């Protein structure tokens, strides 16, 4: 429906090109939802032991991820007064973390969206108008 | 006891280098409380109407306040994980708004604490150990 920000490899919360670009969609898509909509941006990694790195748990790495994303939307115009980050950790996980492939799933970025029920059907089309041909 | 981040103007989100010097205390204090202690940085402003100014409300420019002094807490050391924002707007002034210097102290961020009953001992000390030995 709409991909999640997937992190390059397990220990990293870099922002590559490609996601800036993405990061750029969903600023763009904020920014016509209505301003009582506001945005939780969510952190979560795989299992992966963060032995090799700076991080002593997963869920700083997560918390730096979350950050990081919101801080991308901030420099593409949205306002923080909409904005917010969460770290979930390893909890949580998308996939199993059996597989190289799978353990990549759960480290990510996700927008949960807070809206009343009358803004949830704006927010659908203008999703749907964006992630579509 | 320890003061609240004040900003220069009514208006503005702008940080002076006595105050950044005094975020970079305030980072230093937390990263030595314990682990479970987060930290969340509130936003106020006075009342004073947003003529020729870019924030569309006093949320927006209280949020713009409290998101500010987070990154730079980051920036000095403070581990995301620990870290949140809040504006309150125009609610909650600690001063009337009936003097320019009255209104100077609804201008700020405030530091709140999430502690446990055992862990707001520890953090007593550590600000008494720092802010009046």
Same mark, same amino acid.
């Given at each position: ?6 992190? &390059? ?50 869920? &700083? ?68 108008? &964006?992630?579509?041909?």
């Amino acid at each position: 429906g709409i991909d999640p920000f997937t992190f &390059e490899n397990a220990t990293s919360d870099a922002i590559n090109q490609d996601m800036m670009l993405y990061i750029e969609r969903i600023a763009k898509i904020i920014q016509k939802l209505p301003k009582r909509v506001h945005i939780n941006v969510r952190g979560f990694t795989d299992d992966t032991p963060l032995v090799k790195t700076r991080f002593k748990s997963h869920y &700083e790495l997560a918390a730096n991820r979350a950050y990081r994303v919101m801080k991308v939307l901030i420099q593409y115009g949205v306002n923080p007064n909409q904005l917010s980050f969460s770290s979930y950790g390893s909890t949580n996980p998308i996939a199993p973390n059996d597989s190289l492939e799978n353990r990549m799933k759960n480290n990510r970025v996700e927008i949960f969206f807070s809206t009343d029920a009358n803004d949830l059907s704006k927010i659908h089309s203008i999703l749907d108008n &964006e992630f579509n041909p």
